[PDB]
């Protein structure tokens, strides 16, 4: 399961507050493999589909508008248990519940400005990756650090 | 809500071990707004009042003497849920119980040298702010990061 | 000329050594604006054109092959004097001549593994940007830090 | 020795707004200098005109004053051997385009009008600037435990 | 109990991934006292004895082979509750269970490459210290930070 | 060439001020290979020999006494031009002349407390290595990062 992949996006607040490198560095130092990366301005149409599961929620409309309000950094990361572990590194949805050491615990205050999205499951990750990236934007490369991260 | 304030003080051990910048930087990167700051030598009289609720505890007298033994950095920080969140950033009173990622978890060993004080509630914060600062030392400024920390 | 842009690329050694976030963070903290970003595997054809001015140099062939051997992170950064200033942040071509504090001074040893490319002039930057990015990959966003970086 | 030399430093409003107060303080701490005074204040135009009196004839004087008064500043006094000259080196050239990486301005700024921090340019300026911004009872003497490991 | 000691070792993955400084720095900033340090290539015989309690486990053989595959940084740290607290800083054996903020939580993925060993009790620490170090490699020095870490 | 070695020692001030990890990390991130490491309490006799060339200087006596006053971290690092480049990373003998970005420029004030020693030439390095280390304390290991630092 070392080829598992997750979709992460730095939300517009992360770009505006200059935390892109900080966030990328946390996934690098953890040992995951970066397999796709781009800075994009997502359309409302794409974001509506990205957050389809939340269409009934009262914040859906403002969440979509906000995620479209500025650039996001879309990413795919690969490694064993990357989906679950990425969620742990990011921390709870509401930063007030995310402990220090997590991204949201260290860098945010409020649920509407919580810096980053990560897929919530392997199935969501597959859907999100296909939605945001073409297949030719996902790169296979020989990772020399693999020998020192895996048994 | 977002105008809530807490009182923090770097204790003399924090100054002596050169952790003032490190501590301030953790509150900055979290998103909170610095509204007051000074290096002072607090009197025993002020400290007796600051720690009034601990008058019956066996360590009261040495706690007061210690907090008066050297400079402290007094601070006020503003933001949503700043009192509770500041306590979480700092970690448990006893550093042995404070997880890594918190200030006391990362930087201290023993309860009598635990680097920093934060208000334990909104009501204590109001009392502590008034005790340590005059009203004209609390500054209102237009925070340009506000749009990216709050809805 | 606050709208000046430069092309930067993290070379394969930078990706392999997990210094992408570190590098991006240095440009962020300096105040420059990230306007394009992607992880790509560049073709030999593109790299031959990228390094056209070096066609007569003895290392040209291996430089092309090497830059095509693995993923690169291509970037565009915007700000006053960004081309010249980025070169200063990166440091001399030969890391042995790059002082500590620069990227190559802090992280590299030898000229062939020197982590990063930056455009050497405004004219080179224009050519390099057009070569590596389509116009719709360069984003305009309203920068909230701008008031505090520029008069 | 000259180990009791003092300098005046101020984080300018851009430094506060960009959340670089801790970063800046940390650089002076890790260098070994002793923090002897600190406060967050909103300086008046009158004080700033006097602070920058030597620049009254310069074309940017007016905008410099207005800007330094536009937001909170962190005023500081640091103590140590050669602290005035060495602080200037840590900060870097006035124009960030001339400040090398490793300096504060080299690492964190772009333009001369937004260059994060002020440091005294000489011992005499430092004495004047300290007196202008601080009362004597805001400068603290404390016994520095790291002193044995910074000095002979 | 401020003279309690623990044995820590950076495993070969920690050396290869260049995390020795990072690891040492976390113990320094916590306040503990470094009392012994060396880079060694441990023999399989020593490692078999080190991990004697795990002789029946299925991974014993590969654990021994791996710990002998490269240099290790052997260390002794001294301070109040250093054994238990070191374990907390390192995090759970399986990095998937170690929260962000811990060494394994921040830097590792899998139990077979988990960066570092720490003694699990005072008695194990005594045994491990004697096994890896001669008495004349353990140094007593006067710690100037002690006044600011201990009541 | 790439097998050149230098002797470095963190002086007692570096240990006391908790900068060992910070120092090691700078040599790691630069790309050099750690081939020996130990914490020792050097005798006055060894230090007199270490600094033999300075016997006539007025500060010789106090330099010896001071270097013997607490633990030092002795190290050997390997790589291309490591002797000269280590000196550049360390900075000028007198920290007042060492630019920010160097170890002494970032962390010290005065020549008598300047944190670290590095060999001043290849010949001094050979002498210093033999003086401080037995041959069996210098390790050969296969460095996986070498592919990304060297041609
Ligand atoms: N304004 C607002 N946004 C919310 C709230 N709950 C969730 N969100 C946003 O919706 C995104 C997705 O919600 P969810 O899938 O439950 O959480 P996540 O997996 O941690 O992002 C979050 O990342 C938030 O930005 C809420 O109560 N209010
Ligand atoms: N010496 C000593 N100080 C203690 C003890 N318990 C609490 N304190 C101190 O009392 C201060 C305030 O106590 P408390 O209200 O429990 O906690 P705090 O809000 O975590 O600071 C702490 O910050 C500690 O330094 C104890 O058993 N001994
Ligand atoms: N192997 C090798 N590579 C070189 C040499 N000179 C330059 N290069 C490579 O070619 C790249 C581009 O050369 P140039 O633009 O002169 O330098 P830059 O602007 O500092 O990158 C450098 O960054 C190196 O990767 C050399 O003498 N040998
Ligand atoms: N806008 C602008 N400000 C300037 C210029 N030259 C100097 N300054 C400002 O004047 C302040 C004090 O002047 P100076 O003594 O030259 O600089 P400093 O000692 O490095 O602060 C600087 O810190 C700048 O913010 C200039 O050409 N234009
Ligand atoms: N390869 C492998 N090693 C394991 C496994 N379980 C434990 N270990 C190793 O055993 C070492 C010591 O075992 P234990 O005391 O249970 O863990 P520790 O105290 O966290 O080191 C760990 O540090 C791991 O490297 C496993 O399932 N596979
Ligand atoms: N106290 C004192 N030590 C000095 C002086 N000049 C040199 N040293 C010390 O001598 C050591 C070795 O001498 P040198 O070769 O000049 O310096 P290094 O190679 O940078 O270590 C230095 O590391 C200093 O601590 C001086 O004027 N006074």
Author numbering:
A (entry chain A), B (entry chain B), C (entry chain D), E (entry chain C), F (entry chain F): 19 to 169
D (entry chain E): 18 to 169
Give verbatim lines from the article.
We produced a truncated version of human NDPK isoform C (residues Thr18–Glu169, NDPK-C hereafter) and determined the 3D structure via X-ray crystallography in the absence and presence of various nucleotides. A data analysis revealed a hexameric arrangement, which is organized as three dimers, as previously reported for other functional eukaryotic NDPK variants.
The residues contacting the guanine nucleotide base are the same as in the ADP complex, except for Glu169, which makes contact specifically with the guanine base in the adjacent protomer.
